[PDB]
Amino acid sequence: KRKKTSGDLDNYDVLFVGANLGGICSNHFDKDTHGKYKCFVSFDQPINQIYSVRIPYEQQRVRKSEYIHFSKKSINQFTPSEMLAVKEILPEQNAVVLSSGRRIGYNQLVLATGLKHDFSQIKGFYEALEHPEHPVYANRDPETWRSAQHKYSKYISNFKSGDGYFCIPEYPYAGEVECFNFFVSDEVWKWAQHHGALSPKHTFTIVNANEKFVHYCDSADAFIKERLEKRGIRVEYNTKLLEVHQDGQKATFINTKTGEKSVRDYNNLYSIVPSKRQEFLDKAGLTNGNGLLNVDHQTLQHKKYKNIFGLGDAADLPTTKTFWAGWYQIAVVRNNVKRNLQGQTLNAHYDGFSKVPLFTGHQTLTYVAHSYGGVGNWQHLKHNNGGILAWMRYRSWAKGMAKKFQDFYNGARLGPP
Amino acid sequence: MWYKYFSKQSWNLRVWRKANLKYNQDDFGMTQPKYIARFGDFRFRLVRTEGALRGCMFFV
Ligand SMILES: CCCCCCCCCCCCCCCCCC(=O)OC[C@H](COP(=O)([O-])OCC(O)COP(=O)([O-])OC[C@@H](COC(=O)CCCCCCCCCCCCCCCCC)OC(=O)CCCCCCCCCCCCCCCCC)OC(=O)CCCCCCCCCCCCCCCCC
Numbered sequence: 001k002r003k004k005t006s007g008d009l010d011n012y013d014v015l016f017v018g019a020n021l022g023g024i025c026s027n028h029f030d031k032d033t034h035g036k037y038k039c040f041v042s043f044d045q046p047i048n049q050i051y052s053v054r055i056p057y058e059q060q061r062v063r064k065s066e067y068i069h070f071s072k073k074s075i076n077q078f079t080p081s082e083m084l085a086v087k088e089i090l091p092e093q094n095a096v097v098l099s100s101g102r103r104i105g106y107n108q109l110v111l112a113t114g115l116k117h118d119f120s121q122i123k124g125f126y127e128a129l130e131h132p133e134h135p136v137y138a139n140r141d142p143e144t145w146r147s148a149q150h151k152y153s154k155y156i157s158n159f160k161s162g163d164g165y166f167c168i169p170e171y172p173y174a175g176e177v178e179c180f181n182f183f184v185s186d187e188v189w190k191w192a193q194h195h196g197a198l199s200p201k202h203t204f205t206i207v208n209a210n211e212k213f214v215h216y217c218d219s220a221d222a223f224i225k226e227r228l229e230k231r232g233i234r235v236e237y238n239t240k241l242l243e244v245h246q247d248g249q250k251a252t253f254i255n256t257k258t259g260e261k262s263v264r265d266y267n268n269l270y271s272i273v274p275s276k277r278q279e280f281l282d283k284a285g286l287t288n289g290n291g292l293l294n295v296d297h298q299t300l301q302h303k304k305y306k307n308i309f310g311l312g313d314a315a316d317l318p319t320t321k322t323f324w325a326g327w328y329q330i331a332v333v334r335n336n337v338k339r340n341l342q343g344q345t346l347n348a349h350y351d352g353f354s355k356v357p358l359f360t361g362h363q364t365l366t367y368v369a370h371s372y373g374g375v376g377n378w379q380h381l382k383h384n385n386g387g388i389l390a391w392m393r394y395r396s397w398a399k400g401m402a403k404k405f406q407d408f409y410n411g412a413r414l415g416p417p
Numbered sequence: 418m419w420y421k422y423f424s425k426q427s428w429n430l431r432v433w434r435k436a437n438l439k440y441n442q443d444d445f446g447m448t449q450p451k452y453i454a455r456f457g458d459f460r461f462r463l464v465r466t467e468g469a470l471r472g473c474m475f476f477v
């Protein structure tokens with residue numbers, strides 16, 4: 001019946017920049033407007049890893065096919081797409097130039113570029129991750145691995161001895177709570193110390209560059225540090241990983257507080273991939289300070305250039321940059337964009353809700369849910385000390401969540417509400 | 418000079434107690450799932466292999 005909209009145009013009315021959350025919004029945008037508008041999508045990476053099930057993926061409760069998704073699958077068939085990143089953006093002219101060099105016009109811009117990973121912030125880190133034997137592990141898989149490479153799952157298993165370091169980069173970084181696996185490894189490494197698999201002379205410390213683990217929710221941040229002390233894990237703040245020497249297994253850390261660097265021997269290194277602010281978003285005068293989008297906390301509309309929006313991780317919102325937060329940010333964007341296409345007012349407000357599971361044990365978890373003011377709901381930090389209630393909620397997220405992201409990208413299942 | 422006539426093509430296996438040590442038990446078999454709990458981990462720790470464990474449970 002309906003003919004596919006064209007991609008060989010000079011201008012559009014809505015333009016989504018991103019595939020992870022920019023694709024789900026476009027799929028939810030067109031279905032609400034019944035395809036009244038012709039929109040274009042321009043992402044940068046061909047593969048979207050489901051970091052929300054990263055820890056069940058490391059436990060191999062999720063196959064690699066259910067963790068690796070293409071970017072085209074998030075976008076519907078009616079709308080055209082192209083894997084070309086934007087080179088520069090002209091908000092005063094309402095146009096966007098791609099890396100190829102073709103100028104494309106727009107009436108509304110939805111920026112979902114998120115936080116771009118930068119492996120080059122740590123010298124030699126990427127090459128030590130891609131190596132199929134080196135004990136350097138990371139938060140995401142390199143794209144050069146085949147389907148038979150399962151090094152990601154050997155971080156907890158192959159820790160027979162040595163010094164172990166869990167490195168947290170400088171905020172803002174992607175995957176704050178959803179990639180915290182120091183509680184599941186502690187329980188498994190407690191078993192290894194019982195029957196001798198783990199040597200009694202081993203060291204594990206959390207190298208956190210920031211001062212706190214959860215920035216915008218102090219209720220959950222106090223719980224983490226309280227539980228880390230009860231477990232016995234040592235934490236070092238204001239220290240960030242700087243260089244990884246693959247030859248002698250040396251890790252260069254630097255205390256950003258005092259500017260003092262040191263060299264430490266490691267045998268099991270895990271680091272969350274650090275982010276990097278994209279320079280073109282600063283040349284166009286859209287970001288502020290740290291490099292995040294300066295938009296309204298309520299309507300997600302930018303301060304200036306009211307035709308430009310922002311959501312996901314790239315937006316500067318006083319909340320945890322999770323995926324369930326994006327479920328409630330696409331409903332607001334697809335609404336307010338619909339209102340500016342008709343000149344109407346903006347009645348969609350974002351309350352700052354964000355939900356992320358915190359794996360407190362090998363097979364138990366608790367939910368970190370909070371509003372804009374850091375206040376949690378009925379689920380916040382409940383059944384946190386393990387038990388049947390915590391065990392059932394774990395199996396529902398480990399065995400029954402990865403199969404749901406297929407419907408999210410297709411369009412069969414919408415957000416929670 | 419027996420090592421001069423030794424054939425290194427037999428190094429494809431490392432046989433010890435009738436078991437090949439270069440066996441990818443982390444990707445194949447009952448030992449592949451990393452979500453095993455304390456009991457299953459301690460059980461594989463004792464026998465080190467699935468072939469020996471299954472052989473004993475056959476009679477037990
Ligand atoms: C009932 C009639 C009895 C008649 C007589 C029978 C004879 C009895 C005497 C002999 C006893 C049996 C001996 C068996 C051992 C033989 C040797 C052997 O084979 O190796 C060990 C063998 C190892 O098993 P496995 O296959 O390797 O384990 C699976 C994985 O490998 C393990 O993987 P894992 O370790 O990594 O993780 C395991 C688990 C994680 O598990 C844990 O971590 C938990 C561990 C907690 C330990 C806590 C320790 C506490 C210490 C004590 C308490 C502290 C002190 C308290 C002080 C109090 C003070 C008073 O994780 C999971 O996710 C579990 C999967 C989901 C749960 C599946 C449960 C199925 C239940 C179905 C029935 C439901 C009925 C509910 C009704 C409830 C009310 C009755 O153990 C067993 O065989 C257990 C028996 C199983 C028999 C199955 C056949 C029957 C089917 C179940 C019954 C169905 C209902 C029937 C009645 C219905 C009408 C009522």
Ligand SMILES: NC(=O)c1ccc[n+]([C@@H]2O[C@H](COP(=O)([O-])OP(=O)(O)OC[C@H]3O[C@@H](n4cnc5c(N)ncnc54)[C@H](O)[C@@H]3O)[C@@H](O)[C@H]2O)c1
Nearest residue numbers: 018019020021044045085086114174175312313321322323
């Ligand atoms: N743990 C992690 O490292 C990680 C990484 C990404 C997403 N996530 C999870 O997913 C949630 C939402 O992810 P997200 O969508 O906000 O980030 P994202 O990186 O997944 O999405 C960014 C998209 O925009 C594209 N992009 C980036 N720069 C671009 C440029 N110059 N030009 C054109 N396209 C560009 C990317 O290709 C990508 O399709 C997050 O809240 C988080 O929970 C986690």
